[PDB]
Amino acid sequence: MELKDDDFEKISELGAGNGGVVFKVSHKPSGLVMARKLIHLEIKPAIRNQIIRELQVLHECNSPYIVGFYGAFYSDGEISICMEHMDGGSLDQVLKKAGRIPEQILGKVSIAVIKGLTYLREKHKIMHRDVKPSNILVNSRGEIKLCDFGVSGQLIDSMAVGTRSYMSPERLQGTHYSVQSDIWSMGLSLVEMAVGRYPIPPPDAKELELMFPPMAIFELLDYIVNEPPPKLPSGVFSLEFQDFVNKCLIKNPAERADLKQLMVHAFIKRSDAEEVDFAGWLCSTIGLN
């Protein structure tokens, strides 16, 4: 069934960020509750049809680790992507209320991100391009899914930053990047969620004891690019987890681990075995179920 602007009714606003605003909406004809992302674009009707056309592959992006797609269309200077509503929100939100996310939980998250990337790569030859906590969504059934990945080449073009980057050193330095760059983003996202704040610059020994001005644009980019990468602090995290992120955060992208390797890493094998009530933990910390 086709989706269009007049068949929807706004319920509330889920949030917004840099180029997009997303609403919790009701699709009257079906009764379904959806998340409707609007992207304001001043663009000609030709490239619009290409964006809509390119977004149609979302209909075949079906995975427990990928946010579901309902449909896409254009309204009035807005492109609409309608998707599964995740009632847990994004991980940056849960991080706020949580303060820190337990390592065992991050184990489950890691599994989901890896399987999601792998799915998009193996089944669709798509790289994420934008892995970070707000693009990892969760729900009360304890599912962890990716969204906001680069299916439409043209949409990317029509949008081409913030005061904190999850971009790899190679992507910051030029055009010489690819799927490896997503690994870095994941690594950086996992520290931070683990620690309780964007891990650049790294905390002083005093800042560590407490847990257990904002940096200027160039100073932050220059750090990412030229300073040793961030590490999990010792003692408070398993050696396994430490190695896992160290492998994700190698500056040289060819030496950096790939999805293949990460999938059979000690930390993952260990997390696979662990029985974790994610649904329960999520609802307790953000007060839902």
Ligand SMILES: Nc1ncnc2c1ncn2[C@@H]1O[C@H](COP(=O)(O)OP(=O)(O)NP(=O)(O)O)[C@@H](O)[C@H]1O
């Ligand atoms: N499908 C969804 N279900 C529930 N909540 C959502 C969904 N999609 C987006 N959100 C919420 O909407 C917020 C903003 O989304 P978005 O417009 O993509 O920007 P962002 O990823 O948060 N930051 P940015 O990368 O700078 O644009 C997210 O932080 C989520 O909290």
Ligand SMILES: O=C(NOCCO)c1ccn2cncc2c1Nc1ccc(C2CC2)cc1F
């Ligand atoms: O939204 C995005 N950036 O976020 C910043 C805009 O606030 C982007 C960017 C480039 N893209 C290129 N193609 C799609 C998108 C795309 N959006 C998007 C992608 C996949 C889904 C899957 C159905 C769930 C939903 C989406 F909304």
Ligand SMILES: [Mg+2]
């Ligand atoms: Mg997002």
